[PDB]
DNA sequence: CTATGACCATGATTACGAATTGC
DNA sequence: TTAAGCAATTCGTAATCATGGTCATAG
C-alpha cells in the first residue's frame, strides 16, 4: 500500500489500453486482454488480493460529475 | 527568442531621430552637465528599434499673486523672498523648504473664475528645484511663516498646482503616443554610458525636441510588440493555490508584431519532460528555479512593448514574485527596462459612482505597459458574468484534475500544454477583435493624457488636461476652490404619461447633444460668469449679457469667448467624424464597436458638463449646472406646447395631435393616422419646423415611429421600430423592462421577451396565454433546468451590506469547508439559487451556491419562484390590454395548471410499488391494477413514446461535448458552470435510469440466452 | 358549572435601505 | 492623496397595529 496506489494510477492513464472513465478497472483489464494489446500481470495481482474496496476497484475520477 | 533588428549607422551630427513614445518617467539624478530631476522617454522607431531618451533641465513651478505692499515690487524683497531667514525661530519656516532655488519672477496674468475685466495683474512665478518640495512649501507659505521683512503678509493663495509630467506635456505640446523628433547636432548618443537596456540611447536638452501633431502622415502607428502569457499551478484537493506550497508547473507565451494578421512567436515552458507540439517550441527542466530563470531571460531578450493577459495583475505576477522569493532565486524580479531595479507588489483602490469600487494590486515595470483585459471589460461593459468562458461565448462562441495530468505521463502533459496555450491565445483575439488598442491610442491623442492613465484614473484628469491646454493660449491661471459641502440642485423634468396600449403610430422627436449645445450657444463658462455686482453700475443689458431661469447673468459673445465652448466643439467634431466613418460598415459586430467608439466620445463630452457640478472634485461652479438644467426644462415644455398647439383640426390638418410622453430630451407625439408613411412625413415636417426657434447648433430631429406602443410607467415602455417604410421593421424596443435588467432569473426575462414577441408581432393573446401556461406547468412538474433559476447580485462595499441583511452577502460570508481561499471579494458578482425550507421570515436563509446544490442535490422552492419571481412582472404586462378579468384569466390559467404538481430519514425507504393506471399502492410487483388490468396494451403504448424521446435527448447532448472538446477518441472533462451543456447532460442519465426501470415492470419481449 | 375580559399568538400596513437602469 | 451629475422604480426585512382562541377565575 502507497506503492500499489500509484501502479493503478499509472495503469489508468496509459493511452494504449483505452479511454476509460466510465467503467470499472478490471473490466478494462479484461477488455485489453481479449484484444491482447499487452496487459501487464501486476495490475491483475493487486485486484485479487483485495476485496471490493472502492479505492482499488474504481477509476480515478469515479467521483467528479463528468 | 527572436531579437530586434540591429541599429546600423546612425550618426548624430548629420542625422535626426524620429521615434514614437510610449511611456514617460521621472528620475532624480546625478551626472549633471557641467537640474536634478531628469525625464525618461521610451519609444520605438519607424522600423522597430527601441529608443530610450534622457531629457535634462526642467524644474516644477507654480504661481502666486504679488501682495500690494512695498515688498514684491522691489527687487531687494524679491531676492529676500529667495533668501532664508537666519533666525532660530524660523526652523519651522526655512528648513523643510530651506536653500532651494524657488527664485523670483514677475509676470502679468489673470485668474480664471468669473469675469472682472480684460485687464491683467502682476503675479509671482515661483520655481522649485524638486517636485517633492512643492508639498512642504505649500505647508510653509500658507500656514507657515511669511513674515520676511514685510514683503508678503499672509496669506496669498497658491494657483496651478498640477502634476509634473502633465506640466511637461502641457508645456511642450506633446500628447499620448506622439511622434517626437531630435534634430541634427542636438543629441548625443554616447554621452550616456548604458544604464538601461535599449538599443539607441540619446541624451538631449528639453528645448531641442520637436513634436509632430498627429494628422496627415503623422497618424500612423509603429510596429509594437505584444506579449500574452498564462501559468499553471498544481494544488491540493479542496485547497485553492497558495504561493508558499504550490509549485508553478507551466508557463505559456504568445507574441506578435502589431499589424500582422498572425503571431510570430509561440513558446511553452514545462517542468517535466513533454511531447512535441507542431507550431511551437517546447523546453523542459527538472527544477522550478531553471523555469523561472528561463522565463526572465526570455522576457529580457524579446523585450516587449505591451504585456496583456486575463487576470494577470491579481493572480499571475504576484504568484510568480512570491514563488521566486520563497525558493531563493535572486535574479528573478528584475523584469523592467532599467538594469538595476527590482519589482514590488503594491495595493491600490479606485472608487466612483459610475463603476463602483475596486481594489487591485499593481506590480512595477518601468518602460513596459500593462493591459489586463479583465479590467478593460469591467470598466467598459455591463454584463452578467465576467468569466473568460462567458465573455468568449458572448463575443466569439464557445484544479485537482490538473495535478494528476501532471503526475502521469508525457502525453497527458502535452494535453495540458495545448490547453494552456489556447488559454494564453484567447485574450489576443479579444484585444484585436474588439478594437481596444486603436481606441486607446485615439483617446490618448484626443485628450492629451498618457497611455497608462486610461487604465488607472477617471474622467477628471482628462478635462483638467484639456482646460490647461486651452488656458495657456490667452494667459489665465486656475484657482483652487474646495468646499465641503454644498447642496443639491434640481435635475431634469419628466412629463406625465397617458399610460396603456397604443395601436396608432407615435413619432419620436428629440434633441441631439443637448447639454453641450446649451453650453455652446448661450456662451456659458467659468471665465464669463458675471458676479451679481460687477454689472453695476454699468447699465448695458441688451446684447452684452443674458439672464437664465435660475437667475444668473452671463456676458454675450461680443465681449468674450469661453473656454468650455471650444473644448466641447473639438469633442463634438471628433464624434461626428467617428459617426461619418460608422455610416459605411456592413458587418454587425464591427458596426457595434464603432458605435462603442462614438458612445465613448459622447460620454466624454457629457462628463465635461458633469465636471462643473461635482462638489467633491477640483473646481465646482453649481451656478452653471443650474443654468443648464433650467434651459433644458424650458426648452422641452416649449417643444410640447408647440407640437400640440400647431397641428390641429381647425388649422387644416386632419386630427389634433396629443403628446403622450416626454423624458428630458425626447417627445413622443401621437399623430392620429394609422399609415406609417403619413406619420413619417408629418413627423419629419414637425421636427424640421420646431427646430427653427433656437440658436444654433440647437436642432430637433425625427428618430423613429413606434407601431404598436406599450407604456407601463415612467422609464418603462416597449414598442416596434421603424427606420424607413420599405425597410419594414427593425426590432423591438424594451426600455427599462424585465428583459434587460440583471437582478432576475433567465426564465423570467425569456418569458417576458417571448410574451412580447407573441403579443406584438403576431398579435395573438391565446398563444401567449398557452405559452405562459406551459412555462408555469413545466415549472411545477419539475422539468426546468437550473440554468434558468440562477440569480446574481453584486457584492459592494461591506458596511452598507452590514446595515441590512441580504441573501448574497450571507452566501459569500459563509465560507465553505472545502476552500477558505476562494470566495467572492468586493466588487464581483455572487450567483445563487433559492432552495425550499420552512423559515418563511427570511429568504436569506434559503440561498445556496449552484455547484453545491448540484453535488448535494437540494430541492427547489417552486412556490417562491411562482409567486415572487414570475407573477408580478406578468401582471404588469398583461393587464393594460384587458381589464381585471385578465388578472383572473392568468390566475385561472394558473388554476387549471396549478393542480398538476410533481413530488437522514430518507435512507430508511420502503419503496412501495404503485399501479400505473390509477395510483393504488398494493402488494406484489406487477405494474397494472386488477380493476385496470384489461386496458394494458394502451398503458404500455403510453410511456414507450416517452422512453423513445428520452433516448433521443441523451444522444444529441453527449456527442456535442465531443465536438466542443475537439477529440472523438478521449474522455470529456469540462465542468464549465457557465455552459448549459453541463448539468443538462447530468439529469437525462437519471431520467433514462428511472424510465428504463419502469418498463421492466412489464416482462421482457423475448428470451436472450438462445 | 358557567360570563367576562386579560393574555398569547398570528397576520396586514408602513418605512427605509439596497440595487439597478434611463436621461 | 483620490473620486463626472440627477430622477425614478422595484423588492425584502424589521417594526407597528389589528384581531381571534384559549383560559382563568369570580358568580
Ligand atoms: C446618457 C447621459 C445623458 N446626460 C444628459 C446630457 C445630455 O445632453 C442629455 C440627453 O441625454 P442623451 O440623449 O442620452 O445624450 P445626447 O442627447 O447628448 O446625445 P445623442 O442624442 O446623440 O444620443 O442627457 C448626462 O448628463 N450624462 C449621461 O450620461
Ligand atoms: S458541458 Fe459540453 S458542451 Fe457544455 S461547455 Fe462543456 S464540453 Fe462544451
Ligand atoms: Zn389500477
Structure explained in plain terms:
The structure is cut from a larger assembly and holds chains A (about 70 residues) and B (about 1000 residues). Chain A has about 70 residues and is mainly alpha-helical. Chain A has helices spanning about 5-10, 25-35. Chain A is globular and about 25 Å long. Chain B is α+β, with helices and mostly antiparallel strands. Chain B has 26 helices and 30 strands. In chain B, the strands form seven sheets. In chain B, strands 18, 19, 23, 24, 25, 26 and 27 form a seven-stranded antiparallel β-sheet that branches. In chain B, strands 8-3-2-1-7-9 form a six-stranded mixed β-sheet, covered by helices on one side. The longest helix of chain B has 25 residues, at about 590-610. The relative contact order of chain B is 0.06. The interface of A and B includes residues 15, 19 and 61 of A. Zinc ion binds near residues 917, 918 and 929 of chain B. The structure holds a DNA duplex (23 and 27 nucleotides).
Question: What's the total number of strands of chain A?
Answer: 0
Shape of chain A: globular
Q: What is the β-strand count of chain B?
A: 30
- Taking the alpha carbons of the first and last residues of chain B, their distance comes to 69 Å
Number of helices of chain A: 2
Strand content of chain B: 15-25%
Counted by DSSP, the helix tally of chain B is 26
Rounded Rg of chain B: 36 Å
Structural class of chain A: mainly alpha
Q: What Rg of chain A do the Cα atoms give?
A: 11 Å
> Greatest contact pair?
A-B, 12 and 18 residues
Amino acid at each position: 500500500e502507497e506503492a500499489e496506489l500509484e501502479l493503478l494510477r499509472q495503469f489508468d492513464l496509459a493511452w494504449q489500453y483505452g479511454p476509460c472513465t466510465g467503467i470499472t478497472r478490471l473490466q478494462r483489464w479484461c477488455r485489453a486482454k481479449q484484444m491482447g494489446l499487452e496487459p501487464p500481470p501486476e495490475v491483475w495481482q493487486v485486484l485479487k488480493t483485495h476485496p471490493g474496496d472502492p479505492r482499488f476497484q474504481c477509476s480515478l475520477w469515479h467521483l467528479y460529475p463528468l | 527568442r527572436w531579437l530586434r533588428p540591429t541599429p546600423p549607422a546612425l550618426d548624430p551630427q548629420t542625422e535626426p531621430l524620429i521615434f514614437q513614445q510610449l511611456e514617460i518617467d521621472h528620475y532624480v539624478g546625478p551626472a549633471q552637465p557641467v537640474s536634478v530631476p531628469v525625464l525618461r522617454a521610451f519609444g520605438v522607431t519607424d522600423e522597430g528599434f527601441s529608443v530610450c531618451c534622457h531629457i535634462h533641465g526642467f524644474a516644477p513651478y507654480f504661481y502666486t499673486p504679488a501682495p500690494p505692499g512695498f515688498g514684491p515690487e522691489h527687487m531687494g524683497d524679491l531676492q529676500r523672498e529667495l533668501n532664508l531667514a537666519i533666525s532660530r525661530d524660523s526652523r519651522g519656516g526655512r528648513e523643510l523648504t530651506g536653500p532651494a532655488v524657488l527664485a523670483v519672477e514677475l509676470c502679468s496674468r489673470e485668474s480664471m473664475f468669473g469675469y472682472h475685466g480684460h485687464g491683467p495683474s502682476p503675479f509671482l512665478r515661483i520655481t522649485v528645484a524638486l517636485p517633492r518640495l512643492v508639498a512642504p512649501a505649500r505647508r510653509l507659505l500658507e500656514q507657515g511663516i511669511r513674515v520676511a521683512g514685510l514683503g508678503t503678509p499672509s496669506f496669498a493663495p497658491y494657483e496651478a498646482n498640477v502634476d509634473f509630467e502633465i506640466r511637461f506635456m502641457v508645456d511642450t505640446d506633446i500628447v499620448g503616443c506622439n511622434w517626437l523628433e531630435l534634430p541634427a547636432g542636438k543629441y548625443a548618443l554616447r554621452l550616456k554610458e548604458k544604464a538601461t537596456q535599449c538599443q539607441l540611447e540619446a541624451d538631449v536638452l528639453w528645448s531641442d525636441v520637436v513634436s509632430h501633431p498627429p494628422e496627415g502622415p503623422w497618424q500612423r502607428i509603429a510596429p509594437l510588440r505584444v506579449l500574452s502569457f498564462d501559468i499553471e499551478c498544481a494544488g491540493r484537493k479542496g485547497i485553492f493555490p497558495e504561493p508558499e506550497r504550490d509549485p508553478v508547473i507551466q508557463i505559456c507565451s504568445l507574441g506578435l508584431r502589431w499589424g500582422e494578421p498572425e503571431p510570430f512567436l509561440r513558446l511553452a515552458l514545462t517542468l517535466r519532460p513533454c511531447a512535441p507540439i507542431l507550431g511551437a517550441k517546447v523546453q523542459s527542466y527538472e527544477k522550478e528555479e531553471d523555469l523561472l530563470q528561463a522565463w526572465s531571460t526570455f522576457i529580457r531578450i524579446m523585450d516587449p512593448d505591451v504585456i496583456t493577459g486575463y487576470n494577470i495583475q491579481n493572480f499571475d505576477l504576484p504568484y510568480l514574485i512570491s514563488r521566486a522569493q520563497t525558493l531563493k532565486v535572486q535574479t528573478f524580479p528584475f523584469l523592467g527596462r532599467v538594469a538595476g531595479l527590482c519589482s514590488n507588489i503594491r495595493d491600490s483602490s479606485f472608487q466612483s459612482k459610475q463603476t463602483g469600487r475596486r481594489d487591485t494590486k499593481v506590480v512595477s515595470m518601468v518602460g513596459r505597459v500593462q493591459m489586463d483585459m479583465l479590467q478593460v471589460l469591467l470598466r467598459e461593459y455591463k454584463l452578467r458574468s465576467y468569466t473568460l468562458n462567458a465573455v468568449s461565448f458572448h463575443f466569439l462562441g464557445e484544479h485537482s484534475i490538473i495535478t494528476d495530468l501532471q503526475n502521469g505521463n508525457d502525453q497527458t502533459r502535452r494535453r495540458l500544454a495545448v490547453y494552456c496555450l489556447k488559454d494564453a491565445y484567447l485574450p489576443l483575439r479579444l484585444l484585436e477583435r474588439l478594437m481596444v488598442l486603436v481606441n486607446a491610442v485615439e483617446m490618448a491623442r484626443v485628450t492629451g493624457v498618457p497611455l497608462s492613465y486610461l487604465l488607472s484614473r477617471g474622467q477628471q484628469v482628462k478635462v483638467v488636461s484639456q482646460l490647461l491646454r486651452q488656458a495657456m493660449h490667452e494667459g489665465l491661471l486656475m484657482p483652487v476652490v474646495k468646499s465641503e459641502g454644498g447642496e443639491d440642485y434640481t435635475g431634469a423634468t419628466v412629463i406625465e404619461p397617458l399610460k396603456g396600449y397604443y395601436d396608432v403610430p407615435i413619432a419620436t422627436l428629440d434633441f441631439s447633444s443637448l447639454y453641450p449645445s446649451i453650453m455652446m450657444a448661450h456662451n456659458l463658462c467659468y471665465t464669463t460668469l458675471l458676479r451679481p455686482g460687477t454689472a453695476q453700475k454699468l447699465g448695458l443689458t441688451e446684447d452684452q449679457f443674458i439672464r437664465t431661469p435660475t437667475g444668473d447673468e452671463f456676458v454675450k459673445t461680443s465681449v468674450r469667448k469661453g473656454l468650455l465652448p471650444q473644448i466641447l466643439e473639438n469633442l463634438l467634431s471628433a464624434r461626428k467624424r467617428a459617426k461619418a466613418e460608422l455610416a459605411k460598415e456592413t458587418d454587425p459586430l464591427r458596426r457595434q464597436v464603432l458605435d462603442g467608439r462614438q458612445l465613448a466620445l459622447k460620454v466624454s463630452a457629457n462628463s465635461v458638463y458633469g465636471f462643473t457640478g461635482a462638489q467633491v472634485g477640483k473646481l465646482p461652479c453649481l451656478e452653471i449646472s443650474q443654468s443648464v438644467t433650467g434651459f433644458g426644462r424650458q426648452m422641452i415644455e416649449k417643444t410640447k406646447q408647440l407640437v400640440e398647439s400647431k397641428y390641429t383640426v381647425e388649422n387644416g390638418y386632419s386630427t389634433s395631435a396629443k403628446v403622450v410622453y416626454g423624458d428630458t430630451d425626447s417627445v413622443m407625439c401621437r399623430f392620429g393616422v394609422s399609415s406609417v408613411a403619413e406619420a413619417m412625413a408629418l413627423g419629419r415636417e414637425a421636427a424640421d419646423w420646431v427646430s427653427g426657434h433656437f440658436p444654433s447648433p440647437i436642432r430637433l430631429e425625427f428618430e423613429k415611429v413606434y407601431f404598436p406602443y406599450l407604456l407601463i410607467s415612467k422609464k418603462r415602455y416597449a414598442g416596434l421600430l421603424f427606420s424607413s417604410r420599405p425597410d419594414a421593421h427593425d426590432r423591438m424596443d424594451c426600455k427599462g423592462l424585465e428583459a434587460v435588467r440583471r437582478d432576475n432569473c433567465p426564465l423570467v426575462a425569456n418569458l417576458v421577451t417571448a410574451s412580447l414577441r407573441r403579443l406584438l408581432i403576431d398579435r395573438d393573446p391565446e398563444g401567449a396565454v398557452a405559452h405562459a401556461q406551459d412555462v408555469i406547468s413545466d415549472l411545477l412538474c419539475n422539468r426546468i433546468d437550473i440554468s434558468q433559476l440562477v440569480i446574481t447580485k453584486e457584492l459592494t462595499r461591506a458596511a452598507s451590506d452590514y446595515a441590512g441583511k441580504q441573501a448574497h452577502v450571507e452566501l459569500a460570508e459563509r465560507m465553505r469547508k472545502r476552500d477558505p481561499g476562494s470566495a467572492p471579494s468586493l466588487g464581483d458578482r455572487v450567483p445563487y439559487v433559492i432552495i425550499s425550507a420552512a423559515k418563511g421570515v427570511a429568504a436569506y436563509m434559503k440561498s445556496e451556491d449552484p455547484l453545491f446544490v448540484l453535488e448535494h442535490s437540494l430541492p427547489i422552492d417552486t412556490q417562491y419562484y411562482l409567486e415572487q419571481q414570475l407573477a408580478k412582472p406578468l401582471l404588469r404586462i398583461f393587464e393594460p390590454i384587458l381589464g381585471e378579468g385578465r388578472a383572473e384569466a392568468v390566475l385561472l390559467r394558473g388554476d387549471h395548471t396549478r393542480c398538476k404538481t410533481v413530488l437522514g430519514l430518507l435512507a430508511f425507504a420502503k419503496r412501495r410499488n404503485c399501479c400505473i393506471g390509477c395510483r393504488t399502492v398494493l402488494s406484489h410487483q406487477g405494474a397494472v391494477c386488477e380493476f385496470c388490468q384489461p386496458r394494458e396494451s394502451e398503458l404500455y403504448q403510453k410511456e414507450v413514446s416517452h422512453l423513445n424521446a428520452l433516448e433521443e435527448r441523451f444522444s444529441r447532448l453527449w456527442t456535442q461535448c465531443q465536438r466542443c472538446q475537439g477529440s472523438l477518441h478521449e474522455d470529456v472533462i469540462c465542468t464549465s458552470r457557465d455552459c448549459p451543456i453541463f448539468y443538462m447532460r447530468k439529469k437525462v442519465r437519471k431520467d433514462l435510469e428511472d424510465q428504463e426501470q419502469l418498463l421492466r415492470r412489464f416482462g421482457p419481449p423475448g428470451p436472450e440466452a438462445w
